[PDB]
């Protein structure tokens, strides 16, 4: 079947702020990707093999608000630009890509899946360029192979004149290396 | 929730319509030159193309548009009026082979529906099933290009 995605907002600005401070989130979780925010920015986090990964440049070394209070990161790798917390109870995990697919699909925070042509183990070109603004907020999102397996997490956009033509990602292998270290 | 595919019907038959680029497209062999109903009265087709077996009305309410394919994949997926997804290998410009042939009944009532690529984007509109002895083994479709062109 084709890769289709839908997004659902679970909380607003004020609820987010209280939760950020209390660190206690009682909301029910669902999904493979979570729309995540801090007091400064909003991005994405992807659950892969029971771990909720995201970009260190987004999460920093912060805890994640859970029903039991704040949860300390399981993995933190400033070099890999990754952080991982135990996947929230309720989330569904993606599995790393087996078949080395050349055609990948980036899922944006808007739940749009855009195809990218892999041009390296960490890069791929948007077959269809989009404004850099369209990609804002999607760091930490998954890059899926046709089978819907996780190939990588969106990290940076190769922008020019405000238009992104390529994307830089953290291949799913850096995850294992990060867990191993 | 908004849908990309409308399950429609005339007095004669029932088929599908797919919203792509703000237009609700469907097969001319189902709609003809018929007007689409709306709470404000009938709305005329914005596009009628007998040759391409294509018609289009402005997208209805409760609908959301589909994005045309841009990855040129040949691994297609047909969505039936029952929300079934059928993998189809693109055999050509406007032809594709079911990865698993199904009884013609299974595809009946799905003309107008979409042929999605691995990214869920619109590759084309299911035009007609190509079957041998009552078993659909392939399908005919209207490539999105035609739609983009007709617009």
């Amino acid at each position: 079947a084709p890769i289709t995605a839908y997004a659902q907002q679970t909380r607003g600005l004020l609820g987010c702020i209280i939760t950020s401070l209390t660190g206690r989130d009682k909301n029910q979780v669902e999904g493979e990707v979570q729309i995540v925010s801090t007091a400064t920015q909003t991005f994405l986090a992807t659950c892969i093999n029971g771990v909720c990964w995201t970009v260190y440049h987004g999460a920093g070394t912060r805890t994640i608000a859970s029903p039991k209070g704040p949860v300390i990161q399981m993995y933190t790798n400033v070099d890999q630009d990754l952080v991982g917390w135990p996947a929230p109870q309720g989330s569904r995990s993606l599995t790393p890509c087996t078949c080395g697919s050349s055609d990948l699909y980036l899922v944006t925070r808007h739940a749009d899946v855009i195809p990218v042509r892999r041009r390296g183990d960490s890069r791929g070109s948007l077959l269809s360029p989009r404004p850099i603004s369209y990609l804002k907020g999607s760091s930490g999102g998954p890059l899926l192979c046709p089978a819907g397996h996780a190939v990588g997490l969106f990290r940076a956009a190769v922008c020019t004149r405000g238009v992104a033509k390529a994307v830089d990602f953290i291949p799913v292998e850096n995850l294992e290396t990060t867990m191993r270290s | 929730v908004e849908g990309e595919v409308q399950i429609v019907s005339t007095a004669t038959q029932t088929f599908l319509a797919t919203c792509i680029n703000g237009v609700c497209w469907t097969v001319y062999h189902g709609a003809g030159t018929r007007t689409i109903a709306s709470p404000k009265g009938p709305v005329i087709q914005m596009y009628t193309n007998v040759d391409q077996d294509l018609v289009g009305w402005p997208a209805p309410q409760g609908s959301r548009s589909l994005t045309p394919c841009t990855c040129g994949s040949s691994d297609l997926y047909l969505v039936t009026r029952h929300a079934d997804v059928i993998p189809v290998r693109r055999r050509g410009d406007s032809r594709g082979s079911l990865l698993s042939p199904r009884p013609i009944s299974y595809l009946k009532g799905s003309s107008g529906g979409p042929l999605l690529c691995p990214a869920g984007h619109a590759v084309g509109l299911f035009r007609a099933a190509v079957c041998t002895r009552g078993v659909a083994k392939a399908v005919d479709f209207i490539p999105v290009e035609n739609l983009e062109t007709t617009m």
């Binding site: - | 908004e2 849908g3 990309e4 409308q6 429609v8 019907s9 005339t10 689409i36 109903a37």
Partner: peptide, 16 residues
């Protein structure tokens, strides 16, 4: 006679 919408299909399966 008009073409009438008798139902809708959401491709992502969004329940919302």
């Amino acid at each position: 006679g008009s073409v009438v919408i008798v139902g809708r299909i959401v491709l992502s399966g969004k329940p919302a």
